[PDB]
């Protein structure tokens, strides 16, 4: 059961090992395009937070979820921000959603007084006003019901089957991590030039011990030139110090 486009459900995902291999192997995909990351390089980075949206839209409008578009599903229902990260996984689902009798359980908003900033929601269904004199009771002339139902049939071609859509959005390397792909820890060493991979932050140097106090809501220190030079060991809670060979 996927949501309607105008009342989409956003889900948290935290404290788990994320493997996208069991996902990208799905042959019947029709689209897998990523903006800030590449689809094949998602198995070595740890994300601060992951949110997985969901809705079902008509096949013609699957191109409209990308940032910077406009229309009746990109300004009145669900609008992505201009600086989007993460990526969208869209695939045809004509077998499940569509029905021969005519599926009538998917709505979308048509009339709104003004647009909406990204990632906003509106369950309100008060009658839209178009004329000078407000109406009441039932809608009609100069005032309309804001929601109209999709009509899905298996007859219609591409552009009218429902493409199920799920969108993953995640901030990259600004906070303590909770979710990322499998890896094998390799102990810890000090005062020996090594190749450290701390939560996806590659580099090279020697890791001494430091006495600078980290506030509880911080993980990475920085210096003038905007380069990380103090990290918190993910397993223990020691504060290290990265300096070049």
């Amino acid at each position, epitope marked *: 059961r996927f949501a309607s486009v105008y009342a989409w459900n956003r889900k948290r995902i935290s404290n788990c090992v994320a493997d996208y291999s069991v996902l990208y192997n799905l042959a019947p995909f029709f689209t897998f395009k990523c903006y800030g990351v590449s689809p094949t390089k998602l198995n070595d980075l740890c994300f601060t937070n992951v949110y997985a949206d969901s809705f079902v839209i008509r096949g013609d409008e699957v191109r409209q979820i990308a940032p910077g578009q406009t229309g009746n599903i990109a300004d009145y229902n669900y609008k992505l921000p201009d600086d989007f990260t993460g990526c969208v996984i869209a695939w045809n689902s*004509n*077998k499940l959603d569509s029905k*021969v009798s*005519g599926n009538y359980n998917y709505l979308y908003r048509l009339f709104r007084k003004s647009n909406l900033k990204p990632f906003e929601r509106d369950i309100s269904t008060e009658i839209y006003q178009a004329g000078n004199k407000p109406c009441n009771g039932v809608a009609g002339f100069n005032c309309y019901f804001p929601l109209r139902s999709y009509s899905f*049939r*298996p*007859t*219609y*071609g*591409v552009g009218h089957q429902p493409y199920r859509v799920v969108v993953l959005s995640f901030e990259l390397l600004h906070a303590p991590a909770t979710v990322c792909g499998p890896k094998k820890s390799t102990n810890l060493v000090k005062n020996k030039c090594v190749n450290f991979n701390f939560n996806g932050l590659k580099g090279t140097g020697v890791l001494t011990e430091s006495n600078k106090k980290f506030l509880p809501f911080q993980q990475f220190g920085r210096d003038i030139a905007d380069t990380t030079d103090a990290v918190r060991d993910p397993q223990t809670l020691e504060i290290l110090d990265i300096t070049p060979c």
Partner: antibody
Amino acid sequence: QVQLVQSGAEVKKPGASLKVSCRASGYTFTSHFIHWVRQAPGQGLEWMGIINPSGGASYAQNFRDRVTMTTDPSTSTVYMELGSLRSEDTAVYYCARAEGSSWLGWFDPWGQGTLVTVSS
Amino acid sequence: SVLTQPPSASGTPGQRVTIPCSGSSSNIGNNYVYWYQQLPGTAPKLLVYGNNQRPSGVPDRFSVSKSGTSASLAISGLRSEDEADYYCAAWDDGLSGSGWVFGGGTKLTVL
């Protein structure tokens, strides 16, 4: 034991109307989707469309705008209404059932076949 | 019209005759394919459906296989009743519509 019966049809003028019936017995009528198919002489086969036993129906887009469905889940009958005929639509029609889930499935029942033609 | 089939087929009794059906991603590249055999003055029967199971009441001599994006049906022990027209069916989806397209057909007979 299980078999579908249709209506024998004869010559029809071009632009006329045809009401073809399909009566099924020996199984639960309101459990299987219905496929209607049309075969023209000197050609392959073309399925007319798909029908829910109790509800609406869906049609091939090429053959839309001229075919009408009505259902009656009381005496187990399914009807085609056809209009705006031409001399090039003379063919044979079959009414058949399919698996209860439609699409991918097994089609054991089949239509006895009814002929439509134009001549004078 | 999208489905491509040989215009006709033939073969001596006791031989093995192979019939192809080549489509595309929309027709065969995603879903199952069915094969249908039509006899003169008879309703259509079933030869292979689901591509991994064979119906009841039919001999299993009708060998079937999928070669990538094509279907192949091979027949051995040819007899008089084998003379029939063969079609291949596959639910196809297109940019203008979608349907239950049948194959062009192939007339198989012996002189």
